């Protein structure tokens, strides 16, 4: 749709092309690429070659936006980031010395650790054989499990709410609990794992 | 007396722009006379306009007035 | 209706009223009882202030107008 | 290697050689000197650092040099601080209020005139104010923080005029000013009448050399601008019909002497004013122009590379930059374009990275 075939993907990294004179293979590759110079697609309104961002954060912000409200999702992301920053600094300045020295204040590492901890390991499928749906554990790639964990966190922060709760500080507290290996998303992950383990005698029904 | 003067056009998603890139000013963007801060309150447009100047490692030495 | 003319008249205006009140307060604070509005009207500083405020009322605000206004104020109020 | 945390808390010593110095202020000083005008988006930078550090700006220090030779016999002279939305206009007045507060002056600090106009639910009429509708719920807040503003002259100003309060209490001669302010607070039925009697009392004592009245109002755009408050029949009122602001308009008419008043144009509440307007006339209207008084406008410009380097060097010493690929020399120019030499825009990006 509005883009022909044999077209490449818009690049994002810049330091790789700032001095591409290392060896010969990539040199010949980029020379042959720039010879015929095909019509490269334009950069969308969401990607930036800056070093003060992260592709995972951009993907999470794009997934958070419901409908057409990029400014709303951006404001919510900025509020969540400043909230976790303020909470980290408040728990840092209100401590002793060993705790302040053994912990960091970078929210990116905390968010990455929370994502790696809440990421599942096995998945069940309702295989319809003979008229019944039996769960069979099947392997899943890394990106699929990451997307599943992200959507689980999103739906937990969205659906699970009462009336007096908010949203930025709520998500901040949820991320802080998930980083400490004690969170509701981790509880759901453990429940799914024990449910798959309770039905481990159905692996012979798989065909791939 | 227009040193480092150049113009261009552009048409995408029903939008016409005529940027005037200079190589002798600071690092600001003027949109229809006034600066881009009053016309682009969202950081999205600011990042979209900073991406070309960032890809060439030239920020505080190029001034534009589109 | 004098509020819809081509140029803002300095005479019988609120600007003239408040600047005359300020001049009266200054003359009363400087221990000077001999006050004459006709003598103070011929001052170049109040004339520059009048020209600046009339230009700012007529033509839109830019930068030279407010600069001349600030200069006239700083030269008339005798404050560094 | 940026010289910042070297100058002590002394606004009277800030000269041309102290360019970009993050001077430290005692925590107790902020509670007394600044008990009103405090931006909500800056208090977070004080409780986390425990140091009231403010970069010395060129248009901010230039105003302090003008007050070194300001005669007290001359009437009040306004000092408006206008500029681009974000270049530092609300907090630029803090660099001047702290200077005059140390010289033993009468500080008449006002929080924000924007809140006194918009967002007003409870409305009550008055009889001893030439029949005007004022805000009684607002007088209960400005009078409480007024005692802790200047605890060195409120107990000295004596009442020299009998004021008939209600049908049960009044005001006697020889009374201190500190007791008259905290007199009508317990009675909310007439608590909005104290702001029209105490404010007009310092007009007489300011002419002497012992008292130096200084009105510290933040945002004069709402004092003369039109309001959006309606009565009981759906009809917007005029800004000249509120007793809370009627007596405040007369104060900015150089009716007294002793020093000079100050001002600071903000943008948090300018009704019927566009966002693309930064000029003082375009943000106050015609009513905010016929009674401006010969003042000295100060244009708040952007930032220079001499002060931008002092920003990044201040957060590196406080382990604020928690990013890996960030202290790179090439990455320093990236933060300059994301803010375009603006302190408030850079503070938003630095609030999380
Ligand atoms: N006033 C002041 N603001 C500063 C200073 N340094 C950084 N800032 C920031 O710059 C921003 C300026 O915002 P401002 O123009 O007052 O917002 P406005 O009143 O809505 O126009 C504030 O949010 C501050 O956090 C300083 O020394 N003084």
UniProtKB/Swiss-Prot annotation, chain A:
Q: Where in the cell is it found?
A: Mitochondrion
Keywords (A to Z) from UniProt: Acetylation, Disease variant, Mitochondrion, Primary mitochondrial disease, Ribonucleoprotein, Ribosomal protein, Transit peptide
What are the protein's GO molecular function terms? mRNA binding; RNA binding; rRNA binding; structural constituent of ribosome
> Tell me, which GO biological process terms does this entry list?
mitochondrial translation; ribosomal small subunit assembly; translation
What the record says about family reads: Belongs to the universal ribosomal protein uS7 family.
Q: Which disease is the protein involved in? A: Combined oxidative phosphorylation deficiency 34: An autosomal recessive disorder caused by mitochondrial dysfunction and combined respiratory chain deficiencies of complexes I, III and IV. Clinical manifestations are variable and include congenital sensorineural deafness, lactic acidemia, and progressive hepatic and renal failure.
Q: How does it assemble?
A: Component of the mitochondrial small ribosomal subunit (mt-SSU), essential for mitochondrial protein synthesis. Mature mammalian 55S mitochondrial ribosomes consist of a small (28S) and a large (39S) subunit. The 28S small subunit contains a 12S ribosomal RNA (12S mt-rRNA) and 30 different proteins. The 39S large subunit contains a 16S rRNA (16S mt-rRNA), a copy of mitochondrial valine transfer RNA (mt-tRNA(Val)), which plays an integral structural role, and 52 different proteins.
Which named protein is this? Answer: Small ribosomal subunit protein uS7m
Q: Which organism is it from?
A: Homo sapiens (Human)
From Swiss-Prot, chain B:
Q: In this entry, which stretches build a coiled coil?
A: none
Any idea where this protein resides? Mitochondrion
Q: Taxonomically, which superkingdom?
A: Eukaryota
User: Which residues are recorded with the post-translational modification N6-acetyllysine?
Assistant: 23
Q: How does it assemble?
A: Component of the mitochondrial small ribosomal subunit (mt-SSU). Mature mammalian 55S mitochondrial ribosomes consist of a small (28S) and a large (39S) subunit. The 28S small subunit contains a 12S ribosomal RNA (12S mt-rRNA) and 30 different proteins. The 39S large subunit contains a 16S rRNA (16S mt-rRNA), a copy of mitochondrial valine transfer RNA (mt-tRNA(Val)), which plays an integral structural role, and 52 different proteins.
Q: Which family does it belong to?
A: Belongs to the universal ribosomal protein uS9 family.
Q: Write down what this protein is called.
A: Small ribosomal subunit protein uS9m
Shown part of the complete sequence:
265 to 330 of 396
UniProtKB/Swiss-Prot annotation, chain C:
Q: Which domain of life is it from?
A: Eukaryota
Taking the record's annotation, the residue ranges forming a coiled coil are 14-78
State where the protein is found: Mitochondrion
What gene is this protein translated from?
A: MRPS35
The similarity annotation says: Belongs to the mitochondrion-specific ribosomal protein mS35 family.
Q: How does it assemble?
A: Component of the mitochondrial small ribosomal subunit (mt-SSU). Mature mammalian 55S mitochondrial ribosomes consist of a small (28S) and a large (39S) subunit. The 28S small subunit contains a 12S ribosomal RNA (12S mt-rRNA) and 30 different proteins. The 39S large subunit contains a 16S rRNA (16S mt-rRNA), a copy of mitochondrial valine transfer RNA (mt-tRNA(Val)), which plays an integral structural role, and 52 different proteins.
User: Which stretch of the full sequence is covered here?
Assistant: 244 to 323 of 323
What protein is this chain from?
A: Small ribosomal subunit protein mS35
This chain's source organism reads: Homo sapiens (Human)
Swiss-Prot record, chain D:
* Residues reported to bind GTP: 55, 83-90
Broad EC category: hydrolase
Q: Which family does it belong to?
A: Belongs to the mitochondrion-specific ribosomal protein mS29 family.
User: What name goes with this protein?
Assistant: Small ribosomal subunit protein mS29
Q: What are the Basic and acidic residues biased-composition ranges? A: 7-21
A single Pfam family it belongs to is: DAP3
Illness: Perrault syndrome 7: A form of Perrault syndrome, a sex-influenced disorder characterized by sensorineural deafness in both males and females, and ovarian dysgenesis in females. Affected females have primary amenorrhea, streak gonads, and infertility, whereas affected males show normal pubertal development and are fertile. PRLTS7 inheritance is autosomal recessive. Some affected individuals present with neurologic features.
Summary of the tissues where the protein is detected: Ubiquitous.
Q: List the disulfide bonds.
A: none
Q: What is the effect of changing residue 350 to Y?
A: In PRLTS7; likely pathogenic; decreased thermal stability; decreased GTPase activity
Q: In which compartments does the protein localize?
A: Mitochondrion
Modification N6-acetyllysine, positions: 130, 162
Instruction: Note the InterPro entries from the entry.
Output: P-loop_NTPase, Ribosomal_mS29, Ribosomal_mS29_met
User: What gene codes for this chain?
Assistant: DAP3
């Amino acid at each position: 749709s509005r883009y022909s075939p044999e077209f490449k993907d818009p690049l994002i990294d810049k330091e790789y092309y700032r001095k591409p004179v290392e060896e010969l293979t990539e040199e010949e590759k980029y020379v042959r690429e720039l010879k015929k110079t095909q019509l490269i697609k334009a950069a969308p309104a969401g990607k930036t070659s800056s070093v003060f961002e992260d592709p995972v954060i951009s993907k999470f912000t794009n997934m958070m936006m419901i409908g057409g409200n990029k400014v709303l999702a951006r404001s919510l992301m900025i509020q969540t980031l400043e909230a976790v920053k303020r909470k980290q600094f408040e728990k840092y300045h209100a401590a002793s010395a060993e705790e302040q020295a053994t912990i960091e204040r970078n929210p990116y590492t905390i968010f990455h650790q929370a994502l790696k901890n809440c990421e599942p390991m096995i998945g069940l499928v309702p295989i319809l054989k003979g008229g019944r749906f039996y769960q069979v554990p099947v392997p899943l790639p890394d990106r699929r499990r990451r997307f599943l964990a992200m959507k689980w966190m999103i739906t937990e922060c969205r659906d699970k709410k009462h009336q007096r709760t908010l949203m930025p500080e709520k998500l901040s507290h949820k991320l802080l609990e998930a980083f400490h290996n004690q969170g509701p998303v981790i509880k759901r992950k453990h429940d799914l794992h024990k449910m798959a383990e309770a039905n481990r005698a159905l692996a012979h029904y798989r065909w791939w | 007396q227009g040193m480092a003067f150049s113009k261009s056009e552009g048409k995408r998603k029903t939008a016409k722009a005529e940027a005037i890139v200079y190589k002798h000013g600071s690092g600001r963007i003027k949109v229809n006379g006034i600066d881009y801060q009053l016309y682009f309150p969202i950081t999205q447009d600011r990042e979209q306009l900073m991406f070309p100047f960032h890809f060439v490692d030239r920020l505080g030495k190029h001034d534009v007035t589109c | 209706t004098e509020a819809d003319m081509e140029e803002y008249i300095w005479e019988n205006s609120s600007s003239e009223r408040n600047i005359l009140e300020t001049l009266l307060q200054m003359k009363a604070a400087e221990k000077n009882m001999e006050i004459n509005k006709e003598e103070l009207l011929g001052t170049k500083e109040i004339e520059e202030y009048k020209k600046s405020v009339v230009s700012l009322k007529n033509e839109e605000e830019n930068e030279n107008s407010i600069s001349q206004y600030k200069e006239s104020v700083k030269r008339l109020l005798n404050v560094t | 290697r940026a010289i910042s945390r070297t100058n002590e808390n002394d606004p009277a010593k800030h000269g041309d050689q102290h360019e970009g110095q993050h001077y430290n202020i005692s925590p107790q000083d902020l509670e007394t000197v600044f008990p009103h005008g405090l931006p909500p988006r800056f208090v977070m930078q004080v409780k986390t650092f425990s140091e009231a550090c403010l970069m010395v700006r060129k248009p901010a220090l230039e105003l302090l040099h003008y007050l070194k030779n300001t005669s007290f016999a001359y009437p009040a002279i306004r000092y408006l601080l206008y500029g681009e939305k974000g270049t530092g206009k609300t907090l630029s007045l803090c660099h001047v209020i702290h200077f005059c507060a140390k010289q033993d002056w009468l500080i008449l600090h006002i929080p924000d005139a924007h809140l006194w106009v918009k967002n007003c639910r409870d409305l009550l009429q008055s009889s001893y104010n030439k029949q005007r509708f004022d805000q009684p719920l607002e007088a209960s807040t400005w009078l409480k923080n007024f005692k802790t503003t200047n605890e060195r002259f409120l107990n000295q100003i004596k009442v020299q005029e009998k004021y008939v309060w209600n049908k049960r209490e009044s005001t006697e001669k020889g009374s201190p000013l500190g007791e008259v302010v905290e007199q009508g607070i317990t009675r909310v039925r007439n608590a909005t009448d104290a702001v029209g009697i105490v404010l007009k009392e310092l007009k007489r004592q300011s002419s002497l050399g012992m008292f130096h009245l200084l009105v510290a109002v933040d945002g004069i755009n709402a004092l003369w601008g039109r309001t959006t408050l309606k009565r009981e029949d759906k009809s917007p009122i005029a800004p000249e019909e509120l007793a809370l602001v009627h007596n405040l308009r007369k104060m900015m008419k150089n009716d007294w002497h002793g020093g000079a008043i100050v001002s600071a144009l903000s943008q948090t509440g300018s009704l019927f004013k566009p966002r693309k307007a930064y000029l003082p006339q375009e943000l106050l209207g015609k009513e905010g122009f016929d009674a401006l008084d010969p003042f000295i406008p100060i244009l708040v410009s952007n930032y220079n590379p001499k002060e931008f380097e002092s920003c990044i060097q201040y957060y590196l010493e406080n382990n604020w930059l928690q990013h890996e690929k960030a202290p790179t020399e090439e990455g320093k120019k990236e933060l300059l374009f994301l803010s375009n030499a603006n302190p408030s825009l850079l503070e938003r990006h630095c609030a999380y990275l």
